[PDB]
Amino acid sequence: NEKLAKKKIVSIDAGRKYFSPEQLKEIIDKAKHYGYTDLHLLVGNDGLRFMLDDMSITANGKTYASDDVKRAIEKGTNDYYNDPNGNHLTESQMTDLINYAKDKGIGLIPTVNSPGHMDAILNAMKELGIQNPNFSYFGKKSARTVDLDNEQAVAFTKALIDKYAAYFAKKTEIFNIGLDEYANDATDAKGWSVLQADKYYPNEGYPVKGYEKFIAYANDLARIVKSHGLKPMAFNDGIYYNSDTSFGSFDKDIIVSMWTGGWGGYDVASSKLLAEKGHQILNTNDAWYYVLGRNADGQGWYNLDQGLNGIKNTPITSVPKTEGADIPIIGGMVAAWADTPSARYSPSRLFKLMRHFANANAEYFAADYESAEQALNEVPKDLNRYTAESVTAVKEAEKAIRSLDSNLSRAQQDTIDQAIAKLQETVNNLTLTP
Amino acid sequence: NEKLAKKKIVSIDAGRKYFSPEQLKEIIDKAKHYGYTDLHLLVGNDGLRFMLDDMSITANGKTYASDDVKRAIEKGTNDYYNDPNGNHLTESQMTDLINYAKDKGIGLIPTVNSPGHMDAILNAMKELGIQNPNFSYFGKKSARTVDLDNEQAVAFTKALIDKYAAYFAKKTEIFNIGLDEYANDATDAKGWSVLQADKYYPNEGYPVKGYEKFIAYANDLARIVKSHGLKPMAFNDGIYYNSDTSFGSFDKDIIVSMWTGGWGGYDVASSKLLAEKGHQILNTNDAWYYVLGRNADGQGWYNLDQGLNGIKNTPITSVPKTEGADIPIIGGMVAAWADTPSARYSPSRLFKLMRHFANANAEYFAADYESAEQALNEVPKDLNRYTAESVTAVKEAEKAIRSLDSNLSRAQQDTIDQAIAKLQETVNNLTLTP
Ligand SMILES: C[C@H]1N[C@@H]2[C@@H](O)[C@H](O)[C@@H](CO)O[C@@H]2S1
Ligand SMILES: C[C@H]1N[C@@H]2[C@@H](O)[C@H](O)[C@@H](CO)O[C@@H]2S1
Ligand SMILES: [Mg+2]
Ligand SMILES: [Mg+2]
Ligand SMILES: [Mg+2]
Ligand SMILES: [Mg+2]
Ligand SMILES: [Mg+2]
Ligand SMILES: [Mg+2]
């Protein structure tokens, strides 16, 4: 019961790269087939590729008109990557997609990323006429990150998240506000250290109250998300960066998507510390990542062979940076990313990744009852014309399928498959009365 | 088309007095029958008689626990009026009620009143330990009205409205924040004048920035309601009281429920001014009111005979205080109130009020197709055994009912009724083949 109760999630970066409703439905179908519970769909992640019917934003003592906001966002996304396959999902398409998934027992968790990975929102704010929304670091301007000192940019971003959270309310359960990799371009992947620096190295030009403002921003977004009955989620790397609790406290209702244990000079809080601070954790281990188009060994970081190795060697229970502690999880999430969004999306490769993750952690993933359900639909309804002996065999075989535990794991698939094979054999053995 | 497109609403004061799900369903059934579009259900109006499953409130740097909030509210409501029939509707009952109404094409519009008519919320705040939440006027303490200078009381109230608005989001369209009759007890029905007084009569002890704070409070509640995709509505009397626009501006997205033209020394803005300021208006004329238990002439203000006279003499298009202007309306609302909540609720009297309002404005109210639908269900399906002539008559008569305009008004009911009578006659005249 405890293993199957976990969430098993596939993540798709539909922020950087367009995915059609048709493609996303296929992913949902495989998710259901392999025993997953949720699709985690990034729609704001560098690009912004989801448009509400009403995009009007009220911030800064005014309202930015819906059609201007839409034009600004479409243009801003194209400035990031003008995808020949499409620009954005519409509200009708998203509503239908979420419905389609819900009918299959699959949840959807959106991401609209900020204050990093928000290239298109920054572009859009500039198109609307908001001044200098981007963060800069000693004359290097970030293309991806808002400046938390810019009240008008921050107000516009919060109102945009409020608008999206209102749409997702009641049809979803978790909203991922992101928070990963602050100003990774402008600071050469040292953004958290930069935000914390002035406290410890004053009078050197580091951003004043940088990290303090970041905590308040994270907490303000968590408040917005909670106000719509949704659980806020965020990536781990900026949450108590350098294990430093002295700047303030993150909202404990933020679920942590634990994706990285950090690296040389990128010293993240342990999952131990985060659990201790009262955060639930979704294991989003980068061991399992696939960046689209990096399709074999040698083709770069998070190539498909690397991801498949990570899946084979790092079980769903193995969370980044535990400090040897036993870290409880709400589930595991395998992620496909579109860092090079002009890469060809290969459904077979994504499905291979998804299948391997399910197979490697088979006790966690739901079994497939689809074919048992269909076999039951295909049984002849009326058996009177057949011999009593042969009829009994079919009725007992149907009864046996219907009696199967409805909570079997993928590890126990053969129990279901044997029961189907038995029914089919009895049906084949029906003998007409002489 | 324009008349039938209007909202036709019955209002029920289930704040002061308990109404069961069963009773409210009967009211919905009559509403549908008479051609109404909506039930306007006050649930916070002196008493507070609707409890969410999670009532935890975060305000004032803390959280008031759900069970403590529930206990505080139940007790606070009982302190206002301990109704032997019941205390509150639960979340499950409300969800079911709204569903029941939606299946009948009837919307539900809740009211949770503040900053007046909030006796039970004030009591509840005191039970939780919030200090001095009530407004006072020269040593007379209001039992019904929060003090807008009390930041902790105001913060708790706003968070309570946010919690209710979140529940009603997506299953309703309008949320009535009330705003009527500020401190009517403590000021002898002069509360708006008291809030405005200090601006014009300084150094006399009147509440400093009273009305300015009221505008900001109204606007803050409207912002909260809009954030959940709902349209905020409020009663007219405190909106530009004394036609004074100099204190600030009310949110134009507040629909005005225009209920009173005012009276001696109670000088409200005209509906002309409110329409000019950009507010849509729901005609809630007090001409049509019935206070439960005031059942005949001589039994007090808003007695049933008075209400029935008001219905006969004041059409749905006649809005209070027009200044002779032509005032557009979104619809009309007939209201039953429970000022003396120990009064016996008489469904027949409420239905008489509802019926008279529909009959007096018959071109506005939808016709009843229920009996036509049932007559069609009762037609014999198989007619082969009957003579060709008699069969043709039935088929033509069925076709005629099915061809009726689906947007007839109550004024045109006889067209539907004649078509039913014709079908029934043809069915009676079916003649078996010899
Ligand atoms: C939390 C996420 N942040 C980064 C994401 O933007 C990249 O696409 C991914 C693959 O390069 O790596 C990390 S995971
Ligand atoms: C807006 C509403 N405020 C008052 C309401 O509290 C009373 O029950 C009703 C009947 O006495 O009269 C007015 S209507
Ligand atoms: Mg809309
Ligand atoms: Mg650019
Ligand atoms: Mg909401
Ligand atoms: Mg709940
Ligand atoms: Mg009392
Ligand atoms: Mg809000």
The DSSP secondary structure of B241-302, one letter per residue, reads GGG--TT----TT-EEEE----BTTB-PPPHHHHHHTT--EEE--GGG-EETT--STTS-TT
Considering the domain architecture, whether residues B229 and B354 belong to the same structural domain is answered as yes
Q: Which structure tokens are listed for B285?
A: 């004329």
**How many A from CA of B113 to the centre of ligand 7?**
17
Residue A378 neighbours by CB under 8 Å, 6+ apart: none
Considering the domain architecture, whether residues B351 and B370 belong to the same structural domain is answered as no
Considering the domain architecture, whether residues A187 and A72 belong to the same structural domain is answered as yes
**Nearest ligand, CA of residue B341?**
2
Q: What range does the domain containing A30 cover?
A: 1-365
CATH number at residue B425: 1.20.1270.90
Cβ neighbour number for residue B350 with a 10 Å cutoff? 21
What is the rounded CA–CA span in Å between residue B244 and residue B202?
Answer: 17
Residues of chain B neighbouring A252 (CB-CB closer than 8 A)? none
What is the residue type of A50? F
The reply to whether ligand 2 has any atom less than 6 angstroms from the CB of B351 is no
CATH number at residue A238: 3.20.20.80
**How many A from CA of B77 to the centre of ligand 7?**
9
What is the rounded CA–CA span in Å between residue B307 and residue B290?
Answer: 6
- The residue out of B365, B387, B418 marking a domain boundary is B365
Considering the domain architecture, whether residues B58 and B44 belong to the same structural domain is answered as yes
Residues of chain B neighbouring A54 (CB-CB closer than 8 A)? none
Q: Which structure tokens are listed for B328?
A: 């557009």
Considering the domain architecture, whether residues A241 and A114 belong to the same structural domain is answered as yes
Which of B131, B142, B120, B134 is closest to B46 using CA atoms?
B120
Write the Ramachandran bin of A181: left for phi over 0, alpha for psi from -120 to 50, otherwise beta.
left
Which of B201, B286, B205, B241 is closest to B116 using CA atoms?
B241
What is the rounded CA–CA span in Å between residue A137 and residue A192?
Answer: 12
The reply to whether ligand 2 has any atom less than 6 angstroms from the CB of B46 is no
What is the rounded CA–CA span in Å between residue A341 and residue A352?
Answer: 20
Beta-strand ranges (E) seen in B330-421 are 331-337
Considering the domain architecture, whether residues B415 and B337 belong to the same structural domain is answered as no
Considering the domain architecture, whether residues A410 and A350 belong to the same structural domain is answered as no
Residue A176 neighbours by CB under 8 Å, 6+ apart: A40, A42, A109, A110, A111, A112, A113, A232, A233, A234, A235, A257
**Angle at CA of residue A198, ends A193 and A203, nearest 5°:** 135
What is the rounded CA–CA span in Å between residue A338 and residue A240?
Answer: 27
Mutation choice for A interface testing from B158, B167, B227 by most A CBs within 10 A: B227
Report the residue of chain B nearest A230, measured CA to CA.
B166
The reply to whether ligand 2 has any atom less than 6 angstroms from the CB of B185 is no
Mutation choice for A interface testing from B54, B223, B228, B252 by most A CBs within 10 A: B228
**Whole-number Cα distances in Å, A424 to A241, A413, A421:** 59, 17, 5
Residue indicated by tokens 């919060």: A158
When divided into structural domains, chain B yields a total of 2
What is the residue type of A122? L
Considering the domain architecture, whether residues B412 and B273 belong to the same structural domain is answered as no
- The residue out of A304, A339, A365 marking a domain boundary is A365
Q: Which structure tokens are listed for B230?
A: 């709902």
- The residue out of A319, A336, A365 marking a domain boundary is A365
Considering the domain architecture, whether residues A394 and A297 belong to the same structural domain is answered as no
Experimental approach: X-ray
Q: Are B183 and B176 in contact (CB under 8 A)?
A: no
**How many A from CA of A169 to the centre of ligand 5?**
6
Considering the domain architecture, whether residues B360 and B223 belong to the same structural domain is answered as yes
* Phi and psi, residue B223, nearest 5°: -60, -45
Residues of chain A neighbouring B228 (CB-CB closer than 8 A)? 166, 169, 228
The reply to whether ligand 2 has any atom less than 6 angstroms from the CB of B338 is no
What is the rounded CA–CA span in Å between residue A167 and residue A173?
Answer: 12
Task: Specify which residues B111 forms β-bridges with.
Answer: B42, B176
What is the rounded CA–CA span in Å between residue B90 and residue A391?
Answer: 52
Considering the domain architecture, whether residues B361 and B371 belong to the same structural domain is answered as no
Residue A406 neighbours by CB under 8 Å, 6+ apart: A369
Considering the domain architecture, whether residues A391 and A327 belong to the same structural domain is answered as no
